[PDB]
From Swiss-Prot, chain A:
NCBIfam families: atpD. The gene is ATP5F1B. The modification Phosphothreonine is found at T254. The lineage of its organism: Eukaryota, Metazoa, Chordata, Craniata, Vertebrata. Mg(2+) 1 binds at T155. This is ATP synthase F(1) complex catalytic subunit beta, mitochondrial. It comes from Bos taurus (Bovine).
UniProtKB/Swiss-Prot annotation, chain B:
This is ATP synthase F(1) complex subunit alpha, mitochondrial. The modification Omega-N-methylarginine is found at R138. One of its GO terms (cellular component) is proton-transporting ATP synthase complex. The siderophore enterobactin (Ent) produced by enteric bacteria binds Fe(3+) and helps bacteria scavenge iron ions from the environment. As a consequence, the mammalian siderocalin LCN2 plays an important role in defense against bacterial infections by sequestering iron bound to microbial siderophores. LCN2 can also bind iron bound to endogenous or nutrient-derived iron chelators and plays an important role in cellular iron homeostasis. The modification Phosphothreonine is found at T68. It comes from Bos taurus (Bovine). It comes from the Eukaryota. GO terms for molecular function: ADP binding; ATP binding; proton-transporting ATP synthase activity, rotational mechanism. It is found in: Mitochondrion inner membrane; Cell membrane. The gene is ATP5F1A. Glycans are attached at S10. The modification Phosphoserine is found at S10, S40, S100, S118.
From Swiss-Prot, chain C:
The keyword Cytoplasm does not apply. The modification N6-succinyllysine is found at K67, K77, K135, K139. The keyword Transit peptide applies. The lineage of its organism: Eukaryota, Metazoa, Chordata, Craniata, Vertebrata. The modification N6-acetyllysine is found at K31, K37, K47, K50, K77, K135, K139, K149, K153. Component of the ATP synthase complex composed at least of ATP5F1A/subunit alpha, ATP5F1B/subunit beta, ATP5MC1/subunit c (homooctomer), MT-ATP6/subunit a, MT-ATP8/subunit 8, ATP5ME/subunit e, ATP5MF/subunit f, ATP5MG/subunit g, ATP5MK/subunit k, ATP5MJ/subunit j, ATP5F1C/subunit gamma, ATP5F1D/subunit delta, ATP5F1E/subunit epsilon, ATP5PF/subunit F6, ATP5PB/subunit b, ATP5PD/subunit d, ATP5PO/subunit OSCP. GO terms for molecular function: proton-transporting ATP synthase activity, rotational mechanism. Subunit OSCP, of the mitochondrial membrane ATP synthase complex (F(1)F(0) ATP synthase or Complex V) that produces ATP from ADP in the presence of a proton gradient across the membrane which is generated by electron transport complexes of the respiratory chain. ATP synthase complex consist of a soluble F(1) head domain - the catalytic core - and a membrane F(1) domain - the membrane proton channel. These two domains are linked by a central stalk rotating inside the F(1) region and a stationary peripheral stalk. This is ATP synthase peripheral stalk subunit OSCP, mitochondrial.
UniProtKB/Swiss-Prot annotation, chain D:
Keywords: Acetylation, CF(0), Hydrogen ion transport, Ion transport, Membrane, Mitochondrion, Mitochondrion inner membrane, Phosphoprotein, Transit peptide, Transport. GO terms for cellular component: mitochondrial inner membrane; mitochondrion; proton-transporting ATP synthase complex. The chain holds residues 36 to 101 of 108 of the full protein. It comes from Bos taurus (Bovine). Transmembrane segments: none annotated. The keyword ATP-binding does not apply. One of its GO terms (molecular function) is proton transmembrane transporter activity. This is ATP synthase peripheral stalk subunit F6, mitochondrial. It is found in: Mitochondrion; Mitochondrion inner membrane.
């Protein structure tokens, strides 16, 4: 069927198809558009008109212009032939490696599994990151959401994770750059090439990239999310894959949704949002999971505006999180890299059972002392850089070590670190702190803990000074 | 004649402006061309704004909407105790054909003045701190408030686990039929949970009404009301049922959204007004009924998981005006490892004591106080600064009681265990211990009485209360045992 | 005011606001149909490019248009109210609305008097009957064709889903 | 009604037509096997690759003392 | 340790019946359906009951 | 005249009355109403359509449904016949003890008395509670606001007030439990029965209970206010009384209105409030007064919105508040019974004029004194003693006695307390504290004053504590 542009108000193309209006989400192709100017049916508005959204941009469009419905939602290439390929939203090689050779195609609304398919409980996944494993012990297949503001090398971290993991990964991975800086993706790309993780003799790279950058009109960006999901579901169920799913950022999707909300005529929401936010999310978050048909381990970047999280979006997000990684800009500011918010990088999951108490307890002790240490800051404000109540001083000092002990080099970031990454295998971590807790370095220097790998090397490092 | 047929005038957004069906009863279930259900929310002059249950894209303009001609009802029953269903009572569990013999209209009102009765019949949670400091009964409304994993989930769990023995107790004033409306809790979460209940097999006396995160909004929205109907069913079947409405927060959002989407106003703080009414009536439908209703009860522990202590928060403010107290949970303690979490002052049982065991009341009365004074000094010069001795003690005492006020992860109690340990602290027996060892005491002590002084525990359960003897029995047991525990 | 003759069909607002004017107007004096038909007639006296070309076009910007279609075209025998109500809609732009006003009307002596059952089995042929379940079988002698437009296909639908519905 | 239960019939006569054809990837095309192999392998995952078709044997064991 | 071996075989036979159900179903439902309307008078038996709804729904 | 449901969007039932439109404020009866569904006309929307608010059913409602206009606003049972009856908003037995024994009906919109009808001067009401009268002297017909502790027995006190006043005057009471928990009203009910403030034997108890709980449409609760007023107008005017009007809480009232504001598409206000917040309050407050028949002395239990008053309404409320009650949970906690915030047991109407200087000054001395004692408390508290000179001690002590004299034994909760609610004629009061203040009694203990009404009962106890 064909529709006529009856109104173009930006990338919301209100199309009157009188010829039969296809079900919602049906992807439309605008005729006269040599561009793959996909309109997604949004409303059967009434009166032969559908509200559609172009994903894309509406320049050069005469009114009445004819739009021919693709009769279905977005059908896109899906399956193993995608890795190392950068597609945008429309399954569109922006790999520039041309065709994506997934014969297997998809309508891109892929949905939430059923209760019975729920792999009801999961596994602590280890990352070799002290902080992570310790504090927000990762889940295989979980949705972990990295609250974090921009520019801190969230992306670096994520990347870092990719490095440590996606390299040594059995599964495959999907990278959904949702509203990512094209440039940063460019670079990012170039690293991957470099790294050979994007090994170009492999469209079976460990990661398939879907990039749906900021520059795209929102609809596209919003939808890049579904798209990427649809692919990943292929791998998950079909290719079995333990997917690592990088989303950067869902925030931009949601935001994209919110942007349109008005313009969908709809009310947006409080905090500007899109009223449907929760389902939007819900359906999505629930869209992904660990079935007994693989796992999509979801590394979800969540930009958190003003790191304000009551900021409804993050406020919601948490429900869908399994491990919440709240990266602390303060901590970043404290120079720490990992710059994390430790107490808010959490997993509700952690247990003296699950993670074993050694882990658990060490953490609870740690969590405890540090929060108490905050209480102590208040004291210090009176009492000064080397003057307090002394046990308390010890613990303070220890906190000062501890802080540093989390600090960990980056191989990538010669630019942030200079250093080169030092990975800590987990036990060495638990122990690392457990030991510190044991105060075995209660005579060792304090920042002889900063930007290390495992704890020994920190001891070693003290020597290197003097 | 002709059947009531009608058309979807337009559809998008789950909002079907609907032709015809003039006959429409308010909140009539309609049946869609898409085989879907809807609710005729807005009866507009010439159309019906119809909330689409689930998704819309199946639908399109002009599609026929046939009245179902029914204002909704939900299955009610107690087979359900031992069922995870969605709100409509459907086997999301995958158990299939749910025993769901009744169905009952969801819109069945909250009982009269006279039908009701004041609470004064106990209830408990196995959580000492809770039962002690908020002493509990049946028929209630209490806000459980706290953040993600301010044992958040845990909270419900231990309470439920505790009821097991009570459910192994035979009363209605024991066997508490637990109703968990899981709102916005993604299936994985639920699954995770569900698994727990089963394990605790508290699930057997438990319905889990589940509208996960994904869900269409009305579904989630509805779920509590659903839950409500079902519990009123128990209530009228005597039964004292426990509903945990988990969470109205989630509902609120959805619902608010619903209004807005219906174009309809939300209200104050940008969110609906009579969502209060929603709840007000919802929660009024929970009550402690008189005898006529088989003592009827639904004890409602509604839940809100807070963002940033936003209590100021519209619904919370609202809710604050509604409950029978609110349970404030405090994270700090959690990070501290302290579980319970609670800020107590913030926690309130407006009701307080009337549903409380005398046993506890008798030892606890004293504790509340010991903490009370303690608390001011709990605040005072907390650091390594002296106090006067009185207070050095109170602090010690307080601190002890704090440990005591911890309660393990997935480690419910029983009133005697609690009273026991409370007794222990009250009668000062473990100020003696420096704090770390309390936990060790308690367990050891417990396993000890568990060996012998079930004599006593059983007894205390029996008398419901401490006699001077029981006290005396305690007194030695603890002192000596304590002595043994230590040395 | 003047109590109003709201005999449905009509549409209730939506040039039911109009229609109902004539559901009291036409109605009194019972030029109901007389006028019902005036309109029918009129319609197409419109529907040639009187209609596009100036009729629903203002490019003159209706201001003189409405003061010349009050008199160059509203100039007729169709006028006991007919042109006058036109001359009311005109300024009031409801000229662009007219099919529907007429519709609303015409569904009155023509179809007020209609028929409607529509189950999933039906999708009435709407024939004009004041009574029910009678004609409703004469339909079976009517019955001789369609893709089951007026009355339904009960095949893919009823039944076809059912196997699915069990599983 | 037996245009209804003709169709209960009509599918049930292909209860028998297919069931007494065979059924599987049969009356039905290859499709079933192409999943089947993988789906029954998932069952092998659902138990682990501990052979669900070999009778197991059992531990003979000692904890520590002095 | 015994149960796992047994339950696997149970689980397979269930899963194989469901797959045979889908595939059986897809062929059955796609095969048979036609005679309801190839006999137009098996839509007359719909019209018949529908005239007995016509009269005899009321 | 009939209307048809044309639209129901929530409990705003959009009615086209197809036939004549009556007032605005008109109660319409939806016909088809198993429970009388009064729609209250809110707007004559135009096109013979009125906007109404449904106050009963909000479901099952068939569009088009016939409403036959009740042709006037709501009529409710009135006369004495309301007394000792729990009426709901419709003014109907939620006593559920059978019907109300009415004869009189009333529109619950009665209109605010004329300028002339005001007893232009409202003249101090005395309650017989020292703490109250002295520190917050009431004005007859006055609107008193109550900030105060949960479960303290606000109500206990109130009951006692009812006892003291509504009993010891011709005053009856109307209680409008607005938005309240049905539960507490139940507990209270039995309690009231129990207390004898409600008497199941005084069919006309000194209280008519009116409830307009949360579980209703707001409007109902909102209007429960009007209702309550309406009853009290009966008792005031008709029964010539000082009616005590408990409105609990105005916060809930205002809020109830406001809930509708949205839905009504009304622009509410800053802080979200209904725009009409002022009028809502105002007319209503204006409808309360001292007529020259009686007084509707309005004692308004006040839940404090946002626990500030800056929240416009209370500030406004203040315009209508002239005796202010802040209850001190703490003092109560000192075992003091009654045990208000004394310095915030206040009245704008304390005067060396109206309540005379005897009162005023003595009080001023006292209030001050209490504070002074408070001042010294601060010192001593931290510094142990003879941190004072004992004139300060003396005053401290005097204050303590004065303090204690505010404690009064209790009748309603005599069941708990033992003793009885004692009543303090003003002069004994003024005199009383003055004497203590004068140290004329200071050579006696302080618990003397504890649990006493009359200064004599304090004196007597003083003697008694001096064994």
């Amino acid at each position: 069927t064909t529709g006529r542009i009856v109104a173009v108000i930006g990338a919301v193309v209100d199309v009157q198809f009188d010829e039969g209006l296809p079900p919602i989400l049906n992807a439309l192709e605008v005729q006269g558009r040599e561009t793959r100017l996909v309109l997604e049916v949004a409303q059967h508005l009434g009166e032969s008109t559908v509200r559609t959204i172009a994903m894309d941009g509406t320049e050069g469009l005469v009114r009445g212009q004819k739009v021919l419905d693709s009769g279905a939602p977005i059908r896109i290439p899906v399956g193993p032939e995608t890795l190392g390929r950068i597609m945008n939203v429309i399954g569109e090689p922006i790999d520039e490696r041309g065709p994506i050779k997934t014969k297997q195609f998809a309508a891109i609304h892929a949905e939430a599994p059923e209760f019975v398919e729920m792999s009801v409980e999961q596994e602590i996944l280890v990352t070799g990151i002290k902080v992570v494993d310790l504090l927000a012990p990762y889940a295989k297949g979980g949705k972990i959401g990295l609250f974090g503001g921009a520019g801190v090398g969230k992306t670096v971290l994520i990347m870092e994770l990719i490095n440590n993991v996606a390299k040594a990964h059995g599964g495959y991975s999907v990278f959904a750059g949702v509203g990512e800086r094209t440039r940063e993706g460019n670079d990012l790309y170039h690293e991957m090439i470099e790294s050979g993780v994007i090994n170009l003799k492999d469209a079976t790279s460990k990661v398939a990239l879907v990039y749906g950058q900021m520059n795209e009109p929102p609809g596209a960006r919003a939808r890049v999310a579904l798209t990427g999901l649809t692919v990943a579901e292929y791998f998950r169920d079909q290719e079995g894959q333990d997917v690592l799913l990088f989303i950067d950022n869902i925030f931009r999707f949601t935001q994209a949704g919110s942007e349109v909300s008005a313009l969908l005529g709809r009310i947006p929401s409080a905090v500007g949002y899109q009223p449907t936010l929760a389902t939007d999310m819900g359906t999505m978050q629930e869209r992904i999971t660990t079935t007994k048909k693989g796992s999509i381990t979801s590394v979800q970047a969540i930009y958190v505006p003003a790191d304000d999280l009551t900021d409804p979006a993050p406020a919601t997000t948490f429900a869908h999180l399994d491990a919440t990684t709240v990266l602390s800009r303060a901590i970043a500011e404290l120079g720490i890299y990992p710059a994390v918010d430790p107490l808010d990088s959490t997993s509700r999951i952690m247990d003296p059972n699950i993670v074993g108490s050694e882990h658990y307890d060490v953490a609870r002790g740690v969590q405890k002392i540090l929060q108490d240490y905050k209480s102590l800051q208040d004291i210090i404000a009176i009492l000064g850089m080397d003057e307090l109540s002394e046990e308390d001083k010890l613990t303070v000092s220890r906190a000062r070590k501890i802080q540093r002990f989390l600090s960990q080099p980056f191989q990538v970031a010669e630019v942030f670190t200079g250093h080169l990454g030092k990975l800590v295998p987990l036990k060495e971590t638990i122990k690392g702190f457990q030991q510190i807790l044991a105060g075995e370095y209660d005579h060792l220097p304090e920042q002889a803990f900063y930007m290390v790998g495992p704890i020994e090397e920190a001891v070693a490092k003290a020597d290197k000074l003097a | 004649d002709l059947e009531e047929t009608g058309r979807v005038l337009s559809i998008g957004d789950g909002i079907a402006r609907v032709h015809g069906l003039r006959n429409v009863q308010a909140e009539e279930m309609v049946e869609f061309s898409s085989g879907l259900k809807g609710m005729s929310l807005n009866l507009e002059p010439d159309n019906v704004g119809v909330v689409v249950f689930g998704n819309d894209k199946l639908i399109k303009e002009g599609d026929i909407v046939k009245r179902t001609g029914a204002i909704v009802d939900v299955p009610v029953g107690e087979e359900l105790l031992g069922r995870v269903v969605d709100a409509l009572g459907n086997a999301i569990d995958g158990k299939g054909p749910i025993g769901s013999k009744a169905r009952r209209r969801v819109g069945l009102k909250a009982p009269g003045i006279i039908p009701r009765i004041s609470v004064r019949e106990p209830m408990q949670t196995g959580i000492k701190a809770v039962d002690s400091l908020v002493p509990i009964g049946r028929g209630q409304r209490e806000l459980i408030i706290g953040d993600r994993q301010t044992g958040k989930t845990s909270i419900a769990i231990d309470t439920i686990i505790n009821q097991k023995r009570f459910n192994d107790g035979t009363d209605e004033k024991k066997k508490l039929y637990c109703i968990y409306v899981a709102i916005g809790q993604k299936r994985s979460t639920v699954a995770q949970l569900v698994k727990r209940l089963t394990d605790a097999d508290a699930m057997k006396y438990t319905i889990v009404v589940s509208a996960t995160a994904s869900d269409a909004a009305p579904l989630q929205y509805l779920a509590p009301y659903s839950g409500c109907s079902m519990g009123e069913y128990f209530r009228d079947n005597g039964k004292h049922a426990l509903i945990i409405y988990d969470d109205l927060s989630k509902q609120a959002v959805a619902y608010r959204q619903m209004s807005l989407l219906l174009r309809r106003p939300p209200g104050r703080e940008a969110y609906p007004g009579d969502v209060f009414y929603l709840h007000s009536r919802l929660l009024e439908r929970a009550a402690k009924m008189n005898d006529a209703f088989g003592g009827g009860s639904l004890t409602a522990l509604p839940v809100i998981e807070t963002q940033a202590g936003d209590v100021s928060a519209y619904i919370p403010t609202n809710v604050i005006s509604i409950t029978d107290g609110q349970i404030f949970l405090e994270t700090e303690l959690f990070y501290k490892g302290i579980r319970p979490a609670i800020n107590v002052g913030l926690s309130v049982s407006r009701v307080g004591s009337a549903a409380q065991t005398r046993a506890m009341k008798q030892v606890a009365g004293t504790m509340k106080l010991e903490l009370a004074q303690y608390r001011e000094v709990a605040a005072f010069a907390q650091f390594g600064s002296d106090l006067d001795a009185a207070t050095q003690q109170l602090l010690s005492r307080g601190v002890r009681l704090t440990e005591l006020l911890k309660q393990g992860q997935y480690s419910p109690m029983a009133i005697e265990e609690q009273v026991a340990v409370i007794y222990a602290g009250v009668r000062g027996y473990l100020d003696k211990l420096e704090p770390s060892k309390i936990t060790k005491f308690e367990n050891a002590f417990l396993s000890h009485v568990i060996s012998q002084h079930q004599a006593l525990l059983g007894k205390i359960r029996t008398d419901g209360k401490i006699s001077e003897e029981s006290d005396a029995k305690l007194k030695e047991i603890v002192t000596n045992f304590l002595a043994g525990f230590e040395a | 005011f003047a109590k109003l003759v709201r005999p449905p069909v009509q549409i209730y607002g939506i040039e039911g606001r109009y229609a109902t004017a004539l559901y009291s107007a036409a109605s009194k004096q019972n030029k109901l149909e007389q006028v019902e038909k005036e309109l029918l007639r009129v319609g197409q006296i419109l529907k040639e490019p009187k209609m596009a070309a100036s009729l629903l076009n203002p490019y003159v910007k209706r201001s003189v248009k409405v003061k010349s279609l009050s008199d160059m075209t509203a100039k007729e025998k169709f006028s006991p109210l007919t042109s006058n109500l036109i001359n009311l809609l005109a300024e009031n732009g409801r000229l662009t609305n007219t099919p529907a006003v007429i519709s609303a009307f015409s569904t009155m002596m023509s179809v007020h008097r209609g028929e409607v059952p529509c189950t999933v089995t039906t999708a009435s042929a709407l024939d004009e009957t004041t009574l029910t379940e009678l004609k409703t079988v004469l339909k079976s002698f009517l019955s001789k064709g369609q893709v089951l437009k007026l009355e339904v296909k009960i095949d893919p639908s009823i039944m076809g889903g059912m196997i699915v519905r069990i599983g | 009604l037996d245009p209804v239960q003709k169709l209960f019939v009509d599918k049930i006569r292909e209860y028998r037509t297919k069931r007494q054809t065979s059924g599987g990837p049969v009356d039905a095309g290859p499709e079933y096997q192409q999943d089947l192999d993988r789906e029954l392998f998932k069952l092998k995952q659902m138990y682990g690759k501990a052979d669900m078709n070999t009778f197991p044997n059992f531990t003979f064991e000692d904890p520590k003392f002095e | 340790e015994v149960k796992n071996r047994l339950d696997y075989h149970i689980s397979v036979q269930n899963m194989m019946r469901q797959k045979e159900q889908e595939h059986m179903i897809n062929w059955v439902e796609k095969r048979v359906v036609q005679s309801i309307s190839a006999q137009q008078e098996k839509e007359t038996i719909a019209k018949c009951i529908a005239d007995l709804k016509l009269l005899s729904k009321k």
